[PDB]
Ligand binder design. Structure first.
Ligand SMILES: [Zn+2]
Ligand SMILES: [Zn+2]
Ligand SMILES: [Zn+2]
Ligand SMILES: [Zn+2]
Ligand SMILES: [Zn+2]
Ligand SMILES: [Zn+2]
Ligand SMILES: [Zn+2]
Ligand SMILES: [Zn+2]
Ligand SMILES: [Zn+2]
Ligand SMILES: [Zn+2]
Ligand SMILES: [Zn+2]
Ligand SMILES: [Zn+2]
Lengths: 354, 354
């Protein structure tokens, strides 16, 4: 009783740490993900054309699944990315506390990026709490859309819902650690091994996200492969391998339908980021075996998981990527470099007016 | 200065009239449409498995572009379509005045279809004015989604908007004749050559649709190839060849963005009906020449158009379908039978739980 799924997409992964493109894309395939969008907050950061060119070739050499690379907004590169913009997955704005190179000091710098970045290309924003309203204002002033990363709070999701009710062009994603973990789990985690940005919400925050599922456009892991030597405080959790099992469990419990899952892990990611189809690509999952999330998942070099102990009822059994078996019951069979940059495909270009 | 578009999809076409699958799919390619969904209100109607099997083979022999065929809900076939349901584009309910075979006499028959039709498969409804609210109620009682055909009135679009604000699973399409024509054009058309269902709205209806573009999920021609010997009263207009030129004109005027158009003619149709991608398929359009819609478009056997006289600024220049040039500047180059039933493709199946 296996279910055939399409090639799933994770539009928010941090791959360059111990973790690398090869180790990260392996976790992706083990999670049923055939396409990933890597964030620009690496060392060095992807905030210029030379850095993007290098990262794109390192990924094409190490990635086991297909990918696109985000460009990062900085205090100095507004108006300079116009030539390479189309080659990136989009532009990422880090609006809360972050690294010096990706730190935007004023909302004026936000507006300058919204005005300079090509209007047809995606813009993504890490915006927590009131920052969600502020960035929506900037998007309105510039008359363009914006995608809100990892919505984690009732405050945020209800704000987006009000924006959508008024016809504003806003989309948003939600991560599994904000749908299946809460503050009560900070007692079984602590300040270390628990520090995430946005922080884990209250039970009311988790409940609000589930109640407003219709407002959620995409699911995305926000896979941040930090080791526990680091966490125990860099923010982020690993989640590429736990995402689909957790969500399939929710589908088996009647919390959401299979279509809801597929809309949010396939169709909506494609239409928001204009990511191309993957020919002869599919995932096969088994929903008849219940297991408990171990202390660490097999592939992610993070060597730990915040979902340890949770009972799940779904397993990725097989992943075929562009005609080749890429994953089978605990073994990745495509080598580092099988993955391709989807923005270099002819169908991976974002259509624009002349 | 040509713009490359993806394979566009028209999810609402009546092909079996003079018009046939070969003549209709030719108009589709001339309009930049590479995939169509044919409605079941033919003679005979597609309201049983044998009728569907026949229509599917006639289409596979005459269609020049790819297609899927809707099944039609009747007063007698509820609970009988379960075996062939997955092979259809979806289930079409004709809830207003229609033919005897597709006439549903009571809302109880609606509910029986909503309860029997597979829950994962699309259901589409022709519902005008208050019928839109009634069918949304039935969908809620059965805890499933519904797609509203050709929204034409401020009344309807605002009702759907309220449903969406409350998180109800409803999507809707809008036709070009309800965005670019109004009652004032019934003075240059008359009762004959003007009878359409839903009828042409007032200027306030047209304005309401444009103001609530964010509520519109899909565009669709509702191509009804009736001749003027018939109209001058079968309802419907031809529109496969005028759809894209009219919409591209609106994009050039700043009424909507190219992304808005592509969402509504490509991405959203794919995700609502789970229609598969078309490999090596694209359309090339030129937006630098202004022409006037003639008295009749070249390919549609309808031999007339309600948009006669309107000035447009877009032209389909080239259509490539699965690696072959299917249309070029006034000539269709793929023969009848090149088109395929997308539901028989492995990627064209709607995913479902075991
Ligand atoms: Zn973030
Ligand atoms: Zn992140
Ligand atoms: Zn780290
Ligand atoms: Zn696209
Ligand atoms: Zn099994
Ligand atoms: Zn490669
Ligand atoms: Zn209709
Ligand atoms: Zn119709
Ligand atoms: Zn007719
Ligand atoms: Zn689908
Ligand atoms: Zn030209
Ligand atoms: Zn054929």
């Amino acid at each position: 009783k296996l279910v055939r799924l399409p090639g799933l997409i994770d539009v928010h992964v941090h791959l360059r740490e111990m973790e690398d493109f090869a180790s990260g894309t392996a976790a992706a395939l083990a999670g049923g993900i055939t396409m990933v969008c890597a964030m620009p907050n690496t060392r060095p950061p992807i905030i210029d054309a030379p850095a993007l060119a290098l990262a794109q070739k390192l990924a094409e050499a190490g990635a086991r699944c297909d990918f696109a690379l985000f460009l990062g907004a900085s205090s100095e590169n507004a108006g300079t990315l116009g030539t390479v913009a189309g080659s990136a997955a989009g532009l990422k704005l880090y609006l809360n506390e972050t690294f010096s190179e990706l730190r935007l000091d004023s909302v004026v710098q936000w507006m300058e990026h919204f005005e300079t970045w090509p209007s047809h290309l995606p813009i993504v924003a890490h915006a927590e709490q009131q920052t969600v309203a502020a960035v929506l204002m900037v998007a309105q002033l510039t008359q363009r859309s914006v995608h809100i990363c990892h919505v984690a709070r009732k405050e945020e999701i209800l704000l987006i819902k009000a924006a959508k009710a008024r016809g504003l062009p806003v989309t948003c994603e939600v991560a599994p650690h904000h749908l299946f973990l809460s503050h009560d789990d900070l007692e079984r985690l602590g300040p270390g091994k628990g520090e995430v940005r946005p922080e884990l919400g209250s039970r009311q925050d988790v409940e609000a996200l589930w109640e407003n599922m219709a407002v959620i456009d995409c699911f995305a892991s926000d896979h941040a492969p930090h080791t526990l030597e680091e966490k125990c405080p860099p923010p982020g959790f690993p989640g590429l391998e736990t995402m689909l099992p957790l969500l399939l469990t929710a589908v088996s419990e009647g919390r959401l339908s299979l279509d809801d899952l597929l809309q949010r892990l396939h169709h909506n990611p494609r239409r928001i980021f204009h990511l191309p189809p993957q020919e002869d690509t599919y995932v096969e999952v088994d929903l008849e075996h219940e297991w408990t999330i171990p202390s660490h998942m097999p592939f992610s070099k993070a060597h730990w998981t915040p979902f340890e102990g949770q009972k799940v009822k779904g397993t990725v059994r097989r992943v075929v990527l562009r005609g080749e078996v890429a994953y089978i019951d605990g073994q990745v069979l495509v080598p580092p470099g099988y993955g391709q940059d989807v923005r270099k495909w002819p169908q991976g270009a974002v259509p624009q007016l002349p």
